[PDB]
């Protein structure tokens, strides 16, 4: 229950007013940012910013927000109303959802009121594909960010290891690798069905407690797919 905001694009006063070379006091918290998954399903979702700000000058007509990715884009949010400061029990808070978030990027966000570094500013560095929000990015998913193969690897004989894993719908080829102090076994696997499959890898040395590495070859990740690890254990 408050005045509303209608936001649109607008040019920006060049990325010098935001990234100054002094520190702004850390308890100036009128501007907040958090990374959010916009889509509620478990497929590929855009990752956006939830930029919030708190409104002591009395009234105002617009608040300007600029985001710099190291890109430079600004939004101007016009208030459709104003009240001549804080009617609800919280403060006076607004949020804007937008600005798609890229992997492993540092973000500078500054804001200033119209009419009126800046007191409203927040910085944050985005994580990578192992992050619980950013793993839902399309490029991460296509590298296997959501694959849960649940590797079980079991020593059958002195020269065999049984490796079980659940395939992914993203691809059909996998390479299973067994490694202690050196690679002691390898298997390239083709599997068209979505199931928990089993594979025997021929090993040349002692395979108990070695690392098992599953490399998927999804067509979109080439040689840069997210690899999955497990350990060879004894059998029940």
């Amino acid at each position: 229950p408050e005045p509303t905001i209608q936001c649109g694009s607008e040019p920006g006063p060049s990325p010098e007013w935001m990234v100054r070379h002094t520190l702004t006091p850390g308890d100036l918290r009128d501007l907040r940012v958090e990374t959010i998954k916009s889509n509620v399903d478990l497929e590929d979702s855009p990752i956006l910013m939830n930029i919030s700000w708190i409104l002591s000058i009395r009234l105002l007509k617009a608040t300007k927000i600029c985001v710099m990715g190291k890109s430079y884009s600004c939004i101007r949010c016009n208030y459709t109303q104003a009240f001549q400061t804080r009617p609800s029990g919280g403060k006076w808070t607004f949020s804007y959802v937008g600005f798609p978030v890229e992997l492993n990027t540092v973000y500078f966000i500054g804001a200033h009121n119209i009419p009126n570094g800046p007191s409203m500013a927040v910085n944050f560095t985005s994580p990578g594909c192992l992050d619980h929000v950013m793993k839902y990015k399309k490029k991460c998913i296509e590298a296997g960010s959501l694959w849960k193969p649940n590797i079980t690897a079991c020593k059958r004989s002195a020269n065999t290891v049984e490796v079980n894993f659940t395939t992914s719908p993203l691809g059909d080829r996998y390479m299973a690798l067994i490694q202690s102090t050196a690679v002691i076994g390898t298997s390239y696997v083709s599997e068209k069905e979505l199931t928990r499959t089993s594979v025997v890898v021929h090993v040349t040395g002692e395979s108990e407690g070695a690392v098992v590495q599953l490399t998927p070859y999804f067509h979109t990740c080439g040689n840069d797919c997210i690899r999955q690890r497990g350990t060879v254990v004894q059998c029940p």
Partner: antibody
Amino acid sequence: EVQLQQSGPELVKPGASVKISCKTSGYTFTEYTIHWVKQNHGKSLDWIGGINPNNGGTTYNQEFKGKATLTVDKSSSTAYMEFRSLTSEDSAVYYCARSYYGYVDYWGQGTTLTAAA
Amino acid sequence: QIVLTQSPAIMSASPGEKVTMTCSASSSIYYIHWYQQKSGTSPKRWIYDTSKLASGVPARFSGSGSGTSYSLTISSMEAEDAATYYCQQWSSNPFTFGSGTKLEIKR
């Protein structure tokens, strides 16, 4: 887990330079300001200054500007403070610390500097 | 620049008794933060954002206040509470600390 690892104690002649370091780990180096704090035998804590590792932007307690210099090395995720012309008044324990917002949530373990001729 | 005046500078309390110490800012700040330091080691974040307990601090500690007037309270003194408590602000440059309350054990 977050750790701030400071260099060891130093005995240094007055007038020489010394640079103490703060090796950080367990978090994204560029997201958090690094602060430096002096503590004499008087036990009071004196803020020296802080640095944004992203661009090296700094602000100092003016009693220390031009006496201490703060720098970062993003590649090692390390913060540094250099006294280029140490005096006897600079013998103290020196802490590094990480802040988000106005408070410090992790502290280094402290570095004793002793200025002796 | 905000000077933080802490009172009392030194005090002793018997285990189990209630302790209050105050932090008064020369001008208004948005938050006060408190650190605990025992002799010869690094300060630990203790109470932050005026009234929040750092991870690990027993709830016998509380902080309150607003504007220029803040306090830290121990509902029941324990032996391990013996320490120096520094309040702290960074609503304005420079970042500043208070002069400290040294809390000792009465016996």
